[PDB]
Amino acid sequence: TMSLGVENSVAYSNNSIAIPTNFTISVTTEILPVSMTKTSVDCTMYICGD
Amino acid sequence: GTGVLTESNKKFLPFQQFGRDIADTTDAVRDPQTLEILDITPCSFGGVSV
Numbered sequence: 001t002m003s004l005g006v007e008n009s010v011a012y013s014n015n016s017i018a019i020p021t022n023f024t025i026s027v028t029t030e031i032l033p034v035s036m037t038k039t040s041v042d043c044t045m046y047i048c049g050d
Numbered sequence: 051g052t053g054v055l056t057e058s059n060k061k062f063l064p065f066q067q068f069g070r071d072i073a074d075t076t077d078a079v080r081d082p083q084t085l086e087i088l089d090i091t092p093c094s095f096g097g098v099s100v
C-alpha cells in the first residue's frame with residue numbers, strides 16, 4: 001500500500017517563523033508536443049487501388 | 051501487382067521467394083528464371099496542387 005510520501009509535520013506556532021538563509025538556482029526541464037506528422041491519404045487510391 | 055522493378059542487394063535465402071515490409075506488402079521478388087532479387091517500388095504518385 002503506497003506511502004504517498006514521508007510524513008513531516010511542521011513545528012507550527014503563533015509566534016515562530018522560519019526564514020531561509022541560503023538559496024539555490026536550480027534548472028528543470030519541461031517538455032511539450034507542438035505538432036504532429038502532416039499525414040495525407042488519397043481515399044480513392046486507398047480504397048480502390050487501380 | 052504494379053510498380054517499378056529495380057536491382058537489389060538483399061540476400062534472399064534459397065527457399066525464400068518473397069520479401070515483405072512491416073506492412074506485409076510485397077517488398078521484393080526473385081525472378082523464377084534468374085535467381086536474382088528485384089525490389090518493388092510503388093509507382094510515383096501523390097497529389098497535384100496549384
Ligand SMILES: *[C@@H]1O[C@H](CO)[C@@H](O[C@@H]2O[C@H](CO)[C@@H](O)[C@H](O)[C@H]2NC(C)=O)[C@H](O)[C@H]1NC(C)=O
Pocket residue numbers: 021022023
Ligand atoms: C550557500 O550555499 C552554497 C551551497 O549550498 C555555499 O557554497 C558552498 O560553500 C562551501 C563553503 O562552506 C564550499 O566548500 C562549497 O564549494 C560551495 N559550493 C558552491 C556550489 O558554491 C555557500 O557558501 C552558501 N552561502 C552562505 C552564505 O551560506
Ligand SMILES: *[C@@H]1O[C@H](CO)[C@@H](O)[C@H](O)[C@H]1NC(C)=O
Pocket residue numbers: 083084085
Ligand atoms: C533457364 O534458366 C537459366 C537460368 O538463368 C538460364 O541459364 C537458361 O538459359 C534458361 N533456359 C534456356 C533454354 O535458356
